[PDB]
Write a protein that binds this ligand. Structure first.
Ligand SMILES: Cc1cc2nc3c(=O)[nH]c(=O)nc-3n(C[C@H](O)[C@H](O)[C@H](O)COP(=O)(O)OP(=O)(O)OC[C@H]3O[C@@H](n4cnc5c(N)ncnc54)[C@H](O)[C@@H]3O)c2cc1C
Lengths: 133, 666
């Protein structure tokens, strides 16, 4: 009921290899040409990817910066409030980006700023200006 | 097995069940209660055992009843019926045995037997044993037919039959006790040596052999499960089926390579798309870095928009440097997956050249086994007789198989050099017309009640005919003769002054360099006391090699042998012989086979006797006159000495039932 292990025989393939005097050698040349053209496309893309790696030579090492470490202070200086209002204008509600810019404020502290100074920095208006872009 | 159950087995009967033939002779018993059947079966089995324990002497009804206990020796007529059954059909008191009751005073009925091979000889003994007048007509100057033995000096080698194919269930077991056959077992270890002369490595030899067996199972799957038995209104052969199966394995190799290299491109194009992302992101990073640099040139103190510009470009740049680092890790994962894939390819080929040549040896060996090219064998039916194969190892007849027919010939009336030309059969009787093979104008007429034809299938096939039937054989017989296959297989006997080969190895192969020549001198046998090597010519090579001379064939044999054992180790042979069974006009081939578009049923058709028309119109349905035995007439043991023997025993029983009556059937 099952053909022996590692032996492949299907109704479809038997009918395909029979039914002509040279259906066998047709089907086996078809797959030889399919194979050579797939190996063509490999050599093609290997040379393309080899050229793309020439352009990545160096990595991004000369274009990297040091990381600045500083403790999440809850005191908003006027400097930091002014940085926030601009970050809101540039980034919208991306609280993570706003936090990274200011440098010493956690993501929740930024979300509090949105609530505490909504009226006084017209944060509604600033977000509408961002949405318009 | 053993006991009474072993006697059933050794006589090819089921110990616990009544056969179809028994049902015909004992309908009262088999239709009757199950208790009486067990009594019948025991009597039968016990009677067989008594014969088998000592087949050197006749087993009489009296002696049988003597050794039966109660309740089995109760019914004496049942025991007499069973004994007569077994005797009549050659299950007991067959072959060469001392008779306790000397042959009857007056002979009853007259039978002509055409051919003095094992089938003819065995029938002749039985008919004479039953009290009939028997004469055998034989075209050759000897008995045995396709049992032919070469004898010169102390060299002895069989050009025809040479192997007993196991003793378990084999009637030749009984004959080996009756006649001195030096049966020596054949060790099946067979090393192969390629065309160059180098042995095939043990690792490779097993790889190819296993593949051969898997290829065969595969054809069986094709036949039974997929029903691939007709193609273009033509029956499919075993050879065709094997090509189709092989082609599909080559296809699968290519399909696996295809989908493997397709995985490499899919990964390579995933990498291409990633590297383009990285080139463009590196260009943005380069530009954004410059902008941060420029915004930092504006030295402090500075307004808060200028400060924001520095801080926001710093953020934007590290965010893009994160992205590039993630993409750079994914680049490493895809690049290692390409080494994985490129290190582990599937198979390059299904079979190499050396592989395919070794495989062709296994196909040649199968062509030897069926005595015909694989393109001729029925896919469905080529192995129909496998289930009846005997147990035990195969044995060589070391003193020459001719000892058997020569022994069976003793006491029989055999006209040698007598070639039958015509067989006439009518409601009144038969007339066999034959000539002397030497002076063919000298004509003989044999008048008889019945003719038993053991002419080979190759002879029956001859067009134009060697033997004419009057009236002609009916189409149901002639079509069976046409459909049945008659193959070919030849031997080359090489007699030397000394042994230059391994004396502990009975056989060894030679792998030919081409498929066309795969059967040519493909196997050598070392079976005899004297230094004799026997080379086989199987498959398509058999027929072709008959038109090449002995000197050239023997030269090709030595060439091969020099390759395996070294040029100075192989002398010129003292004596050589080459068989040509297809050329032989009293054979015209070697073995029957189930050809494509034939079946086992054609063997039954070959065995069926012919009944002539009535002599005068409106006269009653006459008696059967022309009977058939031989190798080619026995469905379950075709193409063998034991089959021939059994077919002879069968027909003697049928003829005697007909012309002497069967008292035992009441
Ligand atoms: C090379 C070879 C190897 C073999 N090896 C084996 C083996 O290892 N084991 C095995 O079991 N079997 C083997 N056999 C098969 C075995 O030899 C036969 O199956 C068996 O001997 C045939 O017996 P038969 O009586 O049916 O036919 P045959 O033995 O051929 O007898 C028929 C007789 O009819 C005669 N005849 C033909 N035409 C006429 C005519 N016009 N008038 C009168 N007589 C005629 C013939 O000369 C012959 O004597 C082998 C056969 C060959 C060729």
């Amino acid at each position: 009921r099952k053909p022996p292990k590692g032996m492949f025989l299907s109704q479809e393939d038997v009918e395909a290899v029979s039914a002509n005097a040279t259906a066998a050698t047709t089907v086996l040349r078809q797959l030889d040409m399919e194979l050579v053209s797939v190996k063509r496309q490999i050599q093609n893309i290997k040379q393309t990817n080899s050229a793309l790696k020439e352009k990545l030579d160096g990595g991004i090492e000369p274009y990297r910066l040091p990381e600045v470490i500083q403790k999440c202070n809850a005191r908003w200086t006027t400097e930091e409030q002014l940085l926030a209002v601009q970050a809101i204008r540039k980034y919208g509600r991306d609280f993570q980006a706003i936090s990274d810019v200011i440098g010493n404020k956690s993501v929740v502290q930024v979300k509090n700023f949105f609530v505490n100074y909504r009226r006084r920095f017209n944060i509604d208006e600033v977000l509408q200006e961002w949405e318009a872009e | 097995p053993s006991g009474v159950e072993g006697a059933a087995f050794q006589s090819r009967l089921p110990h616990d069940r009544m056969t179809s033939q028994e049902a015909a002779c004992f309908p009262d018993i088999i239709s009757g209660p199950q208790q009486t059947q067990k009594v019948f079966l025991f009597i039968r089995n016990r009677t067989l055992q008594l014969w088998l324990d000592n087949p050197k002497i006749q087993l009489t009804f009296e002696a049988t009843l003597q050794q039966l206990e109660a309740p089995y020796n109760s019914d004496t007529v049942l025991v007499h019926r069973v004994h007569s059954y077994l005797e009549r059909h050659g299950l007991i008191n067959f072959g060469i045995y001392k008779r306790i009751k000397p042959l009857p005073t007056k002979k009853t009925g007259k039978v002509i037997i055409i051919g003095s091979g094992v089938s003819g000889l065995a029938a002749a003994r039985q008919l004479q044993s039953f009290g009939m007048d028997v004469t055998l007509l034989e075209a050759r100057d000897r008995v045995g037919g396709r049992v032919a033995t070469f004898r010169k000096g102390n060299y002895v080698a069989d050009l025809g039959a040479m192997v007993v194919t196991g003793l378990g269930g084999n009637p030749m077991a009984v004959v080996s006790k009756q006649v001195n056959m030096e049966l020596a077992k054949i060790k099946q270890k067979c090393p192969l040596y390629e065309a160059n002369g180098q042995a095939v490595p043990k690792e490779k030899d097993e790889m190819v052999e296993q593949e051969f067996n898997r290829l065969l199972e595969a054809t069986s799957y094709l036949s039974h499960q997929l029903d691939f038995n007709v193609l273009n209104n033509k029956p499919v052969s075993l050879g065709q089926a094997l090509e189709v199966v092989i082609q599909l394995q080559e296809k699968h190799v290519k399909d696996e390579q295809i989908e493997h290299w397709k995985k490499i491109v899919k990964t390579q194009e995933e990498l291409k798309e990633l590297l383009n992302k990285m080139v463009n992101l590196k260009e943005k990073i380069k530009e954004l870095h410059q902008q941060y640099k420029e915004a930092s040139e504006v030295k402090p103190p500075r307004d808060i928009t200028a400060e924001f510009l520095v801080k926001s470009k710093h953020r934007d740049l590290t965010a893009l440097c994160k992205e590039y680092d993630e993409l750079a890790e994914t680049q490493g994962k895809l690049e290692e997956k390409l080494q994985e894939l490129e290190a582990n390819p599937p198979s390059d080929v299904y079979l190499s050249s050396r592989d395919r040549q070794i495989l062709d040896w296994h196909f040649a060996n199968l062509e030897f086994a069926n005595a015909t090219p694989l393109s001729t064998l029925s896919l469905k039916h080529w192995d129909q007789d496998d289930d009846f194969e005997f147990t035990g190892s195969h044995l060589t007849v070391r003193n020459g198989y001719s000892c058997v027919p020569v022994a069976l010939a003793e006491g029989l009336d055999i006209k040698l050099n007598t070639a039958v030309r015509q067989v006439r059969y009518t409601a009144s009787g038969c007339e066999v017309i034959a000539v002397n093979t030497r002076s063919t104008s000298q004509t003989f007429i044999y008048k008889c009640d019945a003719v038993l034809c053991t002419l080979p299938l190759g002879v029956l096939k001859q067009q134009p005919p060697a033997v004419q039937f009057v009236p002609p054989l009916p189409e149901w017989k002639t079509s069976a003769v046409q459909r049945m296959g008659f193959g070919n297989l030849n031997k080359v006997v090489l007699c030397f002054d000394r042994v230059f080969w391994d004396p502990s190895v009975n056989l060894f192969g030679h792998v030919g360099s081409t498929t066309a020549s795969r059967g040519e001198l493909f196997l050598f046998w070392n079976l005899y006391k004297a230094p004799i090597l026997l080379a086989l010519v199987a498959g398509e090579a058999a027929g072709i090699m008959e038109n090449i001379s002995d000197d050239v064939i023997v030269g090709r044999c030595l060439a091969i042998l020099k390759g395996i054992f070294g040029s100075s180790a192989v002398p010129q042979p003292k004596e050589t012989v080459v068989s040509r069974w297809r050329a032989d006009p009293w054979a015209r081939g070697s073995h029957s086979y189930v050809a494509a578009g034939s079946s086992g049923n054609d063997y039954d058709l070959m065995a069926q006797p012919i009944t002539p028309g009535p002599s005068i119109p409106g006269a009653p349905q006459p008696i059967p006159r022309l009977f058939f035995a031989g190798e080619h007439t026995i469905r379950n043991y075709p193409a063998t000495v034991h089959g021939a023997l059994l077919s002879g025993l069968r027909e003697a029983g049928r003829i005697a039932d007909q012309f002497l009556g069967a008292m035992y059937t009441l």
